[PDB]
Amino acid sequence: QFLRTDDEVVLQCTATIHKEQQKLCLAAEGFGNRLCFLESTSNSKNVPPDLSICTFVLEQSLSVRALQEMLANTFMMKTAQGGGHRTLLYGHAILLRHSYSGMYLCCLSTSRSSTDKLAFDVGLQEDTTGEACWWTIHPASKQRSEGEKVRVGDDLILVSVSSERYLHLSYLHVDAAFQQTLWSVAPISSGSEAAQGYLIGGDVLRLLHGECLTVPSGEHEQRRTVHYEGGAVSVHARSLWRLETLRVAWSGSHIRWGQPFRLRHVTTGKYLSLMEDKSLLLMDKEKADVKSTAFTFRSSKEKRKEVDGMGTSEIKYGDSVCFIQHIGTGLWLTYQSSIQRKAIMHHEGHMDDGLNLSRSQHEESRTARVIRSTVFLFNRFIRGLDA
Amino acid sequence: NANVVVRLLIRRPEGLLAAMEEAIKIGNAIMTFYAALIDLLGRCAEAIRIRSILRSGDLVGVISIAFCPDHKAAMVLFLDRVYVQDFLLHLLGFLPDLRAAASLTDMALALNRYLCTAVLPLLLFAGTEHHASLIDSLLHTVKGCSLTKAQRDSIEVCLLSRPSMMQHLLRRLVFDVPLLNKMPLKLLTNHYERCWKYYCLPGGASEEELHLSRKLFWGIFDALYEQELFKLALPCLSAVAGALPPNF
User: Residue B52: its chain A contacts at CB < 8 A?
Assistant: First the structure.
């Protein structure tokens, strides 16, 4: 209902370009670029955007009086400072980090737009000890007040400390200036969320068999097939599937039997966009629809709706018998008959369709997203040379 | 007050510097009207997060016409407030000013006006030309209140430092001394012992000018209270020449 430290939300506007309700969230690059950017989440049922590039954790909300302690510092900002959860009040300076690349949100001393005299741009530094990273909170609500508790689902003006410029949104630019932007705060995961080894949303994981799955190697079909294997394919990057639910808020809640499943390969970034005729196909967000990406989980071959919170920590990873059913077909993932045995969505096929799982960790996923962005840069720059 | 109001003023000051010197061709309305803006802005001396915003590097009006009574002194104080010791002389600007020291009436009051902006640079070749323009303005007056004010700043600007041009201006007093022994520049003639002593350290034609200066000092000695005051410093000028030689 309210916000404390160690809390994960996002920031959105449904901003306008000619009466657009263009659900533009600020997404940061990281791990190779220090600038952030807008991200439309409107047609997410047919272009599901990334979320891991735009989620942020409330690192430390503090009083403005508390900041000059760090001025008096010339460590570890008293290591808490204080508690505790430090439940959110308006009129606070906050520290903010990226989730994924984990850069800390700061502004810039630059002018990388109009000009438009000396307003400022938005960066991602790692020296938190600097009030570009510090961000005073203003509700734009006389209906609300300042100093009071910050609820869920509010709308704010977030102003800098160094520049003390408001969060400006321009045209499509994100900057710091003497004009402001309201900001939705969609709750995602708080907190803690909730226990070790649980199907919790946003996860990347492996799909084991007892044996596991595989994608082919490189040298390209652009890995668009999917199979089974033993092998160190878990240790390979290709066994990595970032789950997404259709719910934009609370998407890092607990996953349960039969939630909507926007499912996406990591090393490509392509979604598991199921060809509805016979079996599995791979494409990016464009194909990723309720006919192609959205599946369900069933504990039996025979056999989610509404949660504004963390939900019920349903399944662990090793203790998982999940009969995945595509919603648009009712098929179930069985296999055909190098053990690169091809899996197939089907009515029955084999009776081994309640498969097994294992989550990932942060560094390996991080390197995977790095690899994806890496070759995205690389191959386009290669034909840059070729031109 | 300023601390508040500039934070208020992120909203509407109303390409502003694009057409800044635009309507000088075109009723002094917008020109003075933004001169008010810049003069008001230039009033700010930790809380110096402002200084970048105080600097939003706008230096066109410095060399706008480097009216010109009005605006340029406001630019002077603004630049002095918000913004090496010898770099600044490229901004002549005194190239119109100290050279325009005889234009015969906005000019005639900008004359006594800009002596404050002439003192204000109390805060390597063309400095001889700068001292030339300064001497042209000086003997153009040698308005007497602020002129006598700038008379103090002239000597410290002379000893402010190339240094060959500095010794050249140090004996520029001997250059003007050919008409001396007037009562106006008698104080400069008295204080010129300090300029000769300033040339005396690394510096000890020129010795011929020193002999002619000692001859002029002996001629001022028989030229006969202010002159009687400056005659004691003419002996100091002879001693500093000893330590030195070890409307045109």
Answer: 109, 118
HEC string of chain B? CHHHHHHHCCCCCCCCCCCCCCCCCCCCHHHHHHHHHHHHHCCCCCCCCHHHHHCCCCCCHHHCCCCCCHHHHHHHHHHHHHCCCCHHHHHCCHHHHHHHCCCCCHHHHHHHHCHHHHHHHHCCCCHHHHHHHHHHHHHHHCCHHHHHHHHHHHHHHHCCCCHHHHHHHHCHHHHHHHHCCCCCCHHHHHHHHHHHHHHHCCCCCHHHHHHHHHHHHHHHHCCCCHHHHHHHHHHHHHHHHHHCCCCC
Give Cβ neighbours of residue B64 (< 8 Å, ≥ 6 apart): B20, B21, B71, B72, B75
Structure tokens at A289: 């629809």
**Best mutation target, B5, B7, B9, B10, to test chain A (most A CBs within 10 A):** B10
CA angle, B118 then B231 then B148, to 5°: 20
Residue of chain B nearest A110, judged by CA positions: B52
Phi (first) and psi of residue B202, to 5 degrees? -80, -25
- Alpha carbon distance B132, B154 (integer Å): 12
Amino acid at B236: C
